[PDB]
Design a protein around this ligand. Structure first.
Ligand SMILES: CCCCCCCC/C=C\CCCCCCCC(=O)O[C@H](COC(=O)CCCCCCCCCCCCCCC)COP(=O)(O)O
Ligand SMILES: CCCCCCCC/C=C\CCCCCCCC(=O)O[C@H](COC(=O)CCCCCCCCCCCCCCC)COP(=O)(O)O
Ligand SMILES: CCCCCCCC/C=C\CCCCCCCC(=O)O[C@H](COC(=O)CCCCCCCCCCCCCCC)COP(=O)(O)O
Ligand SMILES: CCCCCCCC/C=C\CCCCCCCC(=O)O[C@H](COC(=O)CCCCCCCCCCCCCCC)COP(=O)(O)O
Ligand SMILES: CCCCCCCC/C=C\CCCCCCCC(=O)O[C@H](COC(=O)CCCCCCCCCCCCCCC)COP(=O)(O)O
Ligand SMILES: CCCCCCCC/C=C\CCCCCCCC(=O)O[C@H](COC(=O)CCCCCCCCCCCCCCC)COP(=O)(O)O
Ligand SMILES: CCCCCCCC/C=C\CCCCCCCC(=O)O[C@H](COC(=O)CCCCCCCCCCCCCCC)COP(=O)(O)O
Ligand SMILES: CCCCCCCC/C=C\CCCCCCCC(=O)O[C@H](COC(=O)CCCCCCCCCCCCCCC)COP(=O)(O)O
Ligand SMILES: Nc1ncnc2c1ncn2[C@@H]1O[C@@H]2COP(=O)(O)O[C@H]2[C@H]1O
Ligand SMILES: Nc1ncnc2c1ncn2[C@@H]1O[C@@H]2COP(=O)(O)O[C@H]2[C@H]1O
Ligand SMILES: Nc1ncnc2c1ncn2[C@@H]1O[C@@H]2COP(=O)(O)O[C@H]2[C@H]1O
Ligand SMILES: Nc1ncnc2c1ncn2[C@@H]1O[C@@H]2COP(=O)(O)O[C@H]2[C@H]1O
Lengths: 391, 391, 391, 391
């Protein structure tokens, strides 16, 4: 909406204060020419406290740096201007909460970690500048040298060209080596873990298929069977992106699970002429008991002569029904067609054999659900009965 | 109690000896002015051995450093004063055991790791001081330089300004680089892992909701359904802090599980006028079979015309009961009210539809428990029967 | 087939361009003598775009470096020749997809990571060469010094002998320390994890046996029982390489599970004279319900006087059947033999005791499957009946 | 046995060759005075090839270094003496296989990793010595400087005092920084993981109790209930060391599971006068269905008036049986006693209430097992019947 433009501009003015307060604390020559662009961001902070633990909010909303820089206080009390950086925690939380609705959150956390370490490095460089003795050197060169030393120490590379001389600089260097190096290492570890977490679904698919292929290679499986299995896993990845629905649907509660199920399987519902145009109630019952199954090319979906429980609804593919000895081709079933009603409209062993002419996605309704649905709503069975006899 | 003041003072006097023994081993000018504040801590160690593997206890309780420093022994036997630092392991174990009753233990382990690495750095700096040639330099500056070198080596930064000169210093430096650097890296890794472990419950909530949202975004779920789901996960986090009770209650044994269950669900027990004032026995039976369920705003808790098993007790929220065609508003049920008895006092399909006027927390008693409770204790059913007919 | 020779030659010409473009960008003295061996690889790129997100493909297929090097453009536009390295991502994906059919993929990923970091180091060294002031030095020595500096910075070792002097070199060094060091650390972590993942099956066996042995050592198990258990785990590892079939077979769908099961247990099927030569249908039913079990030497497979459910088919080993008091040796059963039919052809308690004369692998058919198979196909029972009475 | 003295002496002579071959390759002044102690270890290698992939065995068994050092070959062919270090892999595998029978294996792997990195550091130092220009310096000082440089580079500390000068030394330094630093980091990571794995049982106990305590603290559990739960977890840790038997027993097969179960629960079997002296068969049936349960002090094991299924056998503790209103103390049951037979010898609701006077360990036989055992073997019931009536 327009809250996001406000939260982005709060982010912009707090990055402004993070970049500006240490620079002015180092060089007091500023705060004179940057004042016109200042003041307005302080009003922004003081006006963002109504426009929303809020303890950092009320502490950072205080116009404290204005008076500190105006009165030219010495360092013990000049270091108090940095109370305007406590807005960083609140703005980080707000950005994480708001911007996660559209973009991958792991990426957003990675960006937040990068920004935090960069800001900390800039602040440490500014702190290192002050402890240096006063020398007639350009400000740009001085800041470049300080930032170079800060990145060298924080990355645990330590070339050794810039080293502390005074005991004050030595204590500061010790503190930096103890804290900033460890924090940087921890943030790098979190960034590495977050990089790994970017594609957890693809990693789960890869680890499953890798375990299966390792077993198959150990068991001296024939190459004909190595294919038909690796290709099946590849098709699984392609079409379904390794998200097994059963596992992820379980987390949601039943009211929302229903909505998710109808939105997902609405494609199958609309196509099957038996499902579509039927009452909403039947479809609600059906939508949770439809089980996707994947059959490879030239694979036997149903054989002639098993007890026969399940009924299969074709979603995307084509199958063929053959005789008990695979000599009469009967009829070719296709997308939107369904087979398996005779076994249960009557009570006989499987009538014929069903083979897949190609890669096919089939929805399988279980025996228990079929018996319940044929009992509770007969209108549905009526369509089946004309279909069963004709068949 | 007062054991904690004793265990804290043992910690204080053992940190005193960890900080003091190397300093006196380096500078023998001490142990003359720090003796009055000494001696009493040695009595403390010798009096703590009755006041409690205890092998470090009995070895560190020995007044060994007194005689070593009094006789001015040379280094081969002067290094034996450090047997008073074996109390560190025992005091660390005791602190971990005792202070975990009130504070997060992960934080306590983090503090212990920080203290151990700091103490090791101080000791290594003191050891590095002795190997240096005798120079007319201030003790403070010498210790600062040694500590600076120790932190530089241990952090694998290696500026290079302070380097070994004698072969003895070279061997010491090699040993430090081999051991202290690796130990520091391992302790930093443990500290990082412990920082991550500080909020495992919030990480579990985040990983669950992230997986669900990734699935939903992949499946092209409509924004109307993206909300109602993200908000539900947010309410779940808010109210219940992502602790699913079923998972955590399982670990406890049944005797203690009962006490936990009554203390948790006592709020529901006291409110429901049917539950409260009833015999303790009924409530004990009920307290384990009450299943919390969360229904979103404007959601259908019960529909008119399913077989109807469960009975729902309202804990915090409001629901409405409507006609089969949602045209008569009947009665508005509220906090402390319960619905669903007619389906099972009689044996009919669901009488009416129940919708949620707002976000509601409902306790659901299963069909099996309801039948058992209505059989074993009839007094409870009596209240239901007047309620069922009136309804 | 011959696609692999093409994909390998695409890999060869893209490693050629990764190694060549920065070298020519540094030294413009090239591209004159390497032109004859060039041009043909550019035709290879332009001819590989029909011979197959493909956005890197179409961008890298453009003959952009030819015109850049021919017109002698200055650096702002000379840096555009590096658009021929976007083929690296596509060739990496293609190599990972194609070469995984024959070699362990973890090893292939390790090789890819090593190649990527080596190529990045070469590129960074070439970039560092350009920023140096023009000096009358040999090209080989200059490149060696630059590569030495690049490996020093990227490995976070930082000797300090080669350091930036100009502010341009300082900014480049800062960027390298920030990016390349972190990327190198992350790639090293991935390589370590991949090294660990090379033998996940052997790690799972080791962790299972380690947990069991820890429990046994805690419970003060006698050494006679420590052996018979560690040896059994060792035999398990030897023969079956710690791949429990039940766990890995579950992942595959039923059509492919059948093929895997027959190819695996075909050894048992062919040997048993009862199984072999029987109809394909019986064998299909049987092949999924045959449960491998491992019995140690001198171990009681069946005792005389339990109800008796299961029937065991000997696969590799020898067992002995003794009297109820272990005094008559009856008959010695061997490889390919089976026992346990009397208990269920009749309905009696176990007739005799079966002990293992040596380490034996037995296939156990469950009670439920045996009753079903004896009902559905009688021909099989006929062979059993002559066998049962004679026994 | 005596194989271990042989495998230890193979380890000793292969560490001898790992330490000696590079030293002689650097200084050719050796191999003259160390020859008497040599030769015998070469016979040891040539005699260990009968006394046992074995490819490293047959390659390292070849007396190759003798001829290389005797003929004074130049470096290209002098580097071939290092084929006697391929025995390291085979000896490492043999040590890991053999010494794991008595000591924690994680510790053994830690020692192996430490030895491997130390040996690699020594070898790299020896290699760095040769590339140096010939200088009139003591061998001890030269080796100390080389080892100092090797540890500095491998630990990524890089002081900078010892740096390559010739391009040959620069290439060697680059290779060392690329390989040895990464290998050292990976070995340090493995050592850290192994240190963590040393006490996995205590970590599992700690993580379980920590999760439970976090839940309890969140739910505002009263301090009376915080105790009785933390103390129960502490007693669990004390007595059973957090090894839940059910989880670890599952891994073992049934033949070995029986032996483990009888050796563990033999204490309970011998004590109960009903169990002990009974036939081995009954005890075999019982030994798997005895379920340990832990009841806290002053806790209600059985209440008067539930249906009553289970029978409890006291193992270590004391319980009291009271009236329905806790006014008559009846009899005090103790260690070795059992209660709960009346509920099932007759068919009545629980006769009286059983409370624990102290912390008690109870074995609980389930209802199904009790009915089966009372049917199959009546002799056992006979003892129960006199006991039931008297009670
Ligand atoms: C860090 C505190 C530095 C301690 C001495 C620095 C000092 O006295 O100079 C002062 C230098 O200014 C600073 O210290 C700024 C440091 C703040 C770091 C903020 C981190 C951002 C995240 C001014 O005078
Ligand atoms: C470490 C042993 C240092 C080896 C030589 C040091 C030495 O000789 O001087 C001695 C220096 O004193 C020390 O070595 C103290 C070192 C103990 C380290 C204790 C670690 C605390 C945890 C005194 O003379
Ligand atoms: C986060 C924490 C920050 C401040 C902690 C640093 C301690 C301040 C010591 C000041 C000091 O010793 O005076 C210095 C001059 O005095 C001297 O010559 C050195 C005398 C002994 C120095 C103490 C040895 C360094 C210990 C630093 C510990 C830092 C680790 C905490 C993180 C310059 O000021
Ligand atoms: C990296 C960009 C270097 C920024 C300045 C380098 C420069 O201006 O010189 C240019 C040096 O050539 C290069 O920069 C090549 C760098 C490309 C790195 C490719 C990485 C491969 C993976 C030529 O002039
Ligand atoms: C494991 C592997 C080991 C040996 C691989 C090192 C390559 C040998 C190059 C020899 C060489 O360039 O000559 C050197 C003198 O020639 C020169 O002046 C340098 C000319 C270009 C140098 C090449 C740049 C260094 C590349 C080293 C790559 C090492 C990474 C593999 C691991 C001294 O010999
Ligand atoms: C990936 C990214 C690459 C390029 C980002 C580097 C910023 C370029 C700054 C150029 C510059 O400041 O001029 C330099 C000379 O100017 C000066 O004297 C320094 C003035 C302030 C320097 C800024 C402090 C260094 C900040 C570098 C940040 C690099 C981190 C991004 C990754 C030489 O050119
Ligand atoms: C590593 C090979 C070093 C490459 C040049 C070294 C060289 O030429 O000197 C030779 C120095 O001797 C060596 O290289 C020994 C290096 C073997 C490392 C063995 C690692 C043990 C695990 C003798 O001449
Ligand atoms: C934990 C362990 C601590 C002590 C282990 C260090 C070995 C002591 C060697 C003493 C020595 O070599 O004499 C040194 C003088 O002799 C020399 O010139 C050097 C002669 C060969 C030096 C040996 C090469 C260094 C090996 C150190 C190994 C340290 C690794 C163990 C951790 C100074 O004393
Ligand atoms: N003549 C036919 N034409 C089209 N479909 C058929 C015919 N005979 C059988 N089928 C279908 O093929 C299925 C295979 O056997 P079922 O008993 O499962 O149910 C069968 C019917 O759905
Ligand atoms: N007239 C009514 N007034 C209040 N509550 C009712 C009334 N009729 C039905 N209910 C409740 O609404 C519930 C919905 O149908 P059930 O059969 O589950 O049980 C029902 C009763 O608990
Ligand atoms: N005389 C015999 N010769 C060979 N095998 C036998 C004989 N008697 C019993 N068996 C086998 O030993 C098995 C052990 O008892 P079961 O009842 O399980 O089934 C038995 C038969 O398979
Ligand atoms: N008079 C008694 N003396 C000793 N034990 C008893 C007596 N009465 C009951 N018990 C035991 O106390 C148990 C509690 O009730 P149960 O029906 O479980 O089985 C009971 C008997 O084992």
């Amino acid at each position: 909406t327009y809250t996001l433009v406000w939260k982005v501009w709060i982010l912009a003015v707090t990055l402004y204060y993070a970049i500006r307060i240490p620079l002015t604390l180092v060089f007091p020559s500023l705060f004179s020419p940057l004042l016109p662009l200042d003041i307005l961001a302080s009003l922004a902070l003081i006006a963002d406290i109504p426009l929303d633990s809020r303890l950092p909010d009320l502490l950072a909303a205080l116009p404290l740096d204005l008076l500190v820089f105006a009165l030219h206080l010495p360092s013990p009390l000049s270091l108090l201007s940095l109370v305007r950086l406590l807005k960083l925690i609140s703005v980080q939380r707000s950005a994480t909460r708001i911007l996660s609705y559209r973009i991958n959150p792991a990426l957003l956390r990675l960006l937040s970690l990068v920004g935090f370490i960069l800001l900390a490095a800039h602040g440490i460089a500014c702190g290192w500048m002050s402890l240096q003795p006063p020398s007639e050197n350009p400000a740009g060169t001085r800041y470049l040298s300080a930032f170079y030393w800060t990145i060298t120490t924080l990355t645990t590379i330590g070339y050794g060209d810039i080293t502390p001389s005074t005991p004050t600089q030595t204590v500061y260097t010790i503190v930096i080596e103890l804290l900033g190096a460890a924090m940087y290492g921890l943030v790098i570890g979190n960034i590495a873990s977050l990089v790994s977490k970017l594609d957890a679904a693809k990693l789960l698919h890869r680890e499953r298929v890798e375990r299966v292929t390792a077993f198959l290679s150990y068991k001296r499986i024939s190459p004909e069977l190595q294919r038909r299995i690796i290709e099946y896993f590849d098709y699984l990845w392609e079409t379904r992106r390794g998200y097994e629905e059963r596992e992820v649907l379980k987390e949601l509660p039943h009211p929302l699970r229903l909505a998710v199920a109808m939105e997902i399987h609405g494609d199958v519902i609309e196509k099957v002429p038996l499902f579509k145009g039927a009452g909403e109630e039947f479809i609600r019952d059906i939508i949770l008991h439809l089980e996707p199954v994947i059959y490879g090319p030239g694979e036997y979906i149903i054989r002639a002569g098993e007890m026969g429980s399940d009924v299969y609804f074709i979603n995307r593919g084509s199958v063929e029904v053959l005789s008990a000895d695979e000599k009469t081709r009967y009829a070719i079933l296709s997308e939107g067609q369904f087979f398996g009603e005779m076994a249960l409209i009557l009570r006989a062993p499987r009538t014929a054999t069903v083979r897949a002419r190609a890669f096919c996605d089939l929805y399988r309704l279980d025996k228990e659900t079929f018996d319940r649905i044929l009992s509770r709503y007969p209108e549905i069975a009526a369509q089946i009965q004309e279909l069963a006899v004709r068949r």
